[PDB]
């Protein structure tokens, strides 16, 4: 939900 399905700031935003 909160993470753009790509955690670890792969596309800049994530967790």
């Amino acid at each position: 939900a909160f993470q753009p399905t790509t955690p670890g700031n792969s596309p800049g935003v994530g967790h």
Side-chain angles (χ1 to χ4, degrees):
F2 292 93
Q3 70 289 89
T5 61
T6 48
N9 59 88
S10 309
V13 183
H15 186 77

